[PDB]
Amino acid sequence: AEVTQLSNGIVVATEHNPSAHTASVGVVFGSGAANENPYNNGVSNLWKNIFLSKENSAVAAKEGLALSSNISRDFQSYIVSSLPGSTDKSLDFLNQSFIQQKANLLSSSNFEATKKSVLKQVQDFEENDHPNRVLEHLHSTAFQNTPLSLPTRGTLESLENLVVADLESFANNHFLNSNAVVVGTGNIKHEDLVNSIESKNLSLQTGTKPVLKKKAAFLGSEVRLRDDTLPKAWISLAVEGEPVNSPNYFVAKLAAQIFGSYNAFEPASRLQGIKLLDNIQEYQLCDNFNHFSLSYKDSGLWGFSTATRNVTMIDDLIHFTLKQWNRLTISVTDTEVERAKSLLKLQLGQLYESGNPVNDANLLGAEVLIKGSKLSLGEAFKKIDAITVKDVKAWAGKRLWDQDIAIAGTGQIEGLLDYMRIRSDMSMMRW
């Protein structure tokens, strides 16, 4: 039940778990949206979609195995789920239809059908979703002129201007062996440990990933798309988080989980909570919270996303959330910290140990590429109880106190005051 890693050409990792019985084997490429230029955006999306359609049609018809994928910023988590006794076939298919050969896959007809399907999908995502749209806009506005602001889906202008050659060029400049691994989360033990290294079962295109000239940055900005047609409102604050592989990941995660989520239309959420939730609930101010502190290998983001219903009362919601963040960095009760520790413990336990093998496989791939070695949750629990009020005070004195913010929302934001009524009030002039 212990994760094993090595380094033999291509990194192979394994998180054995005979609890579940859905074996999964796949790859986790250490590149994606962050590793590609603004002018050719949805190349990763197109890859994922051509796979997820035609290879799905092939695999289900031939054998029994359902293949998924995921792209967040720098992954292509082409996980291929299977039965416990059917991992060799899955690996053989993966190495015979993803790395090579790509001729039977990139026919002009299949590529064009997938291209139009991707266009339709991104279009109706733009026309329907809203919290995801404002989150993508928040990324695109926080990291202007940097290979991290471009979204994980892409723009129609960038989507339309690529046919075959750009796709193959990106394939040959990022589907290498140096920054590609194999993940076997499920209930396999060592068959994957030896079958990945075989006479020829190896990714093509030996070499290295082209290093980006600039990594990441930050700057305060706004991208609002004010349109009164939409019913509700949407906003998303942000403060620069802490990158992965740093002695600040868990303290930032706790500093985010203190305030916690909130759904105003649930009998089991209004009653519980801390000061801001009560002071909001006295009137009607907000309708959802999401304190998220996302982190990436270049830089991380500590955010605060809402989707309210009241339109005249945006300013008061923002003012209260800012005063609560100041309260976080000035003085915190010990019971608050203890409750946060317990909640974050259970949240990590649920997230990392969900029964679905695909989630565990993707997270293991992310960690093995970024951290260089898997961090078993035992050490996380051991090192999480040591987080103390002084440490959080110190961390918030750096990341939060008078630091530039970025917000970006679509809807009836118009009531929101522009910048100096949401920025120069993070200290309330009496600390």
Partner 1 sequence: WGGFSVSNPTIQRFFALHYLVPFIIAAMVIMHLMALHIHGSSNPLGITGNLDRIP
Ligand X SMILES: CCCCCCCCCCCCCCCC(=O)OC[C@H](COP(=O)(O)OCCN)OC(=O)CCCCCCCCCCCCCCC
Ligand Y SMILES: CCCCCCCCCCCCCCCCCC(=O)OC[C@H](COP(=O)([O-])OCC(O)COP(=O)([O-])OC[C@@H](COC(=O)CCCCCCCCCCCCCCCCC)OC(=O)CCCCCCCCCCCCCCCCC)OC(=O)CCCCCCCCCCCCCCCCC
**Contact at 8 Å (CB) between 105 and 56?**
no
Q: Which residue's Cβ lies closest to ligand Y?
A: 428
Contact residue for ligand Y among 116, 213, 390, 430 (CB under 6 A)? 430
Q: Which of partner 1, ligand X, ligand Y, none has residue 169 at its interface (CB below 5 to 8 Å by kind)? A: none
> What is the largest distance, in Å, between two alpha-carbon atoms of the chain?
69
How many residues lie near ligand Y (CB under 6 A)? 5
Give the angle 279-283-287 at the CA atoms, nearest 5°. Answer: 85
Q: Tell how strand 288-294 and strand 262-263 pair up.
A: antiparallel
Q: Which of ligand Y, partner 1, ligand X, none has residue 328 at its interface (CB below 5 to 8 Å by kind)? A: ligand X
Q: Which of ligand X, partner 1, ligand Y, none has residue 424 at its interface (CB below 5 to 8 Å by kind)? A: ligand X
Residues 378-417 that bind partner 1 (CB under 8 A): 417
* Residue 116 interacting with ligand Y (CB under 6 A): no
Supply the minimum distance, in Å, between the C-beta of residue 397 and ligand X.
14
Q: Would the CA dihedral through 57, 59, 61, 65 be positive or negative?
A: negative
Q: Which residues have C-beta within 8 Å of that of residue 27, sequence separation ≥ 6?
A: 76, 77, 78, 94, 98, 180, 181, 182, 183, 365
Based on the number of CB atoms within 10 Å of its own CB, is 52 exposed (0-12), middle (13-18) or buried (19 or more)? Answer: middle
Closest CA to 180 of 199, 201, 200, 208: 208
Q: Which residues have C-beta within 8 Å of that of residue 31, sequence separation ≥ 6?
A: 74, 76, 174, 179, 209
Query: Which run of H or E residues covers position 306?
Result: strand 301-306
* Residue 319 interacting with ligand Y (CB under 6 A): yes
Supply the minimum distance, in Å, between the C-beta of residue 424 and ligand Y.
8
* Residue 390 interacting with ligand Y (CB under 6 A): no
Supply the minimum distance, in Å, between the C-beta of residue 230 and partner 1.
18
Question: Whose Cβ is closer to ligand X: residue 5's or residue 324's?
Answer: 324
Supply the minimum distance, in Å, between the C-beta of residue 327 and ligand X.
3
Q: Tell how strand 180-183 and strand 24-29 pair up.
A: antiparallel
Closest CA to 302 of 371, 246, 352, 243: 243
Contact residue for ligand Y among 127, 266, 429, 431 (CB under 6 A)? 429
Query: After which residues does a break in the chain occur, C–N more than 2.5 Å?
Result: none
Supply the minimum distance, in Å, between the C-beta of residue 310 and ligand Y.
18
Supply the minimum distance, in Å, between the C-beta of residue 393 and ligand Y.
20
Q: Which of partner 1, ligand Y, ligand X, none has residue 209 at its interface (CB below 5 to 8 Å by kind)? A: none
Q: Which of ligand Y, partner 1, ligand X, none has residue 376 at its interface (CB below 5 to 8 Å by kind)? A: none
Tell me if residue 80 falls in helix, strand or coil. Answer: strand
Contact residue for partner 1 among 101, 355, 418, 424 (CB under 8 A)? 418
Q: Which of ligand X, partner 1, ligand Y, none has residue 319 at its interface (CB below 5 to 8 Å by kind)? A: ligand Y
Report the C-alpha gap between 136 and 351 in whole angstroms. Answer: 23
Q: Which of partner 1, ligand Y, ligand X, none has residue 275 at its interface (CB below 5 to 8 Å by kind)? A: ligand X
**What is the binding site for ligand X (CB under 6 A)?**
274-275, 324, 327-328, 331-333, 336, 420, 424-425, 430
As beta bridge partners, residue 304 has 237, 291
Footprint of partner 1 (CB under 8 A): 417-418, 421
